[PDB]
Design brief:
homotetramer; 101 residues; mainly alpha; Helix Hairpins; globular; hydrolase (chain B); EC 3.6.1.12 (chain B)
């Protein structure tokens, strides 16, 4: 019915290419520095779930404030991941295809 | 000159959404959804982040750069980078977070 | 004065000290394997942050100024404590798993 | 009963200092001190944390549980927990941080 279960989907933009072009528009962008920075954000992301066990409600039912924190940490991880991949000259989008075979 | 010249770029596709749907299909087709719970995907991502760090662990800061890494290492790097990306996408989708939008927002 | 770790506390001391700090707070419900594992990943992240701005220059962390060294000690010990807590929750004898690993 | 539970405890040794020495000896024998710079050890630690995370990734916490896993898995667990501790010890030492003392200092507040 009209009140439930629309499928979840991502917006079509920005794309991985757009995201990279945005990062460079914003030294310390050495591979290991970006890798360490990624690890730090992955840690932030993990902090949000550490005490969130089975006995509790999942992320799509978390309070708007909590969800906002989740969107931020997920975002940070992606940003450094794109930056790192770019820096390494790895065609990230393609790498995903050259994988699934 | 007409030599080592290539303004590195990402291909215009797959898009993050293409990657999501792509991975969603691959899973639904194998009945993997049961494993795709948030903490599971989070821990899977951490596992892949560990694999990626392994490629850089003994690599010095003054060295050439991943760009100049032998081909076998460059291939491993491609795989791990994209392994981490796939799980990050799976995790955001499972949490119903529109990743692309959260990044421009960020 | 050659560098060394102090003789104690030991890993067992650490396990004990942590086990009591939490008990005196009724935190046992929070010490489930995956919870502790994720908390540990969280601290490894804090530790990583102290080094992303750096580079392995000859003068290492040993020459880091006071505030930065206090921070490194803190994050390092934060990681160790959750690791100890995780091992205990898993009934893994960490000290022995180590020697038996050589 | 006789087949019921019992208090869990770590062995009295090796100590953290003992572990630092054993690892130092190992890197000495194989000549790895040159690769054991702080950032290398951190990233190596991150790698082992990844190995450890893999053992738990598809396991719920309301499931059998580690103290009940198959011996082969419990063996892998022991190995990965050890790997994380070893690099942690190595990173600390390489940074001249008295790890045990840092714990005490922490507990003081």
């Amino acid at each position: 019915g009209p009140l439930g279960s629309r499928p979840f989907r991502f917006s079509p933009e920005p794309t991985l290419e757009d995201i990279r072009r945005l990062h460079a528009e914003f030294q310390f962008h050495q591979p290991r520095n970006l890798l360490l920075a990624l690890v730090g954000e992955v840690g932030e992301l993990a902090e949000l779930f550490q005490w969130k066990s089975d006995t509790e409600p999942g992320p799509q039912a978390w309070p708007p404030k909590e969800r906002a924190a989740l969107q931020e940490e997920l975002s940070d991880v992606l940003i450094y991941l794109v930056a790192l991949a770019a820096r390494c000259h790895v065609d990230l989008p393609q790498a995903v295809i050259s994988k699934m075979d």
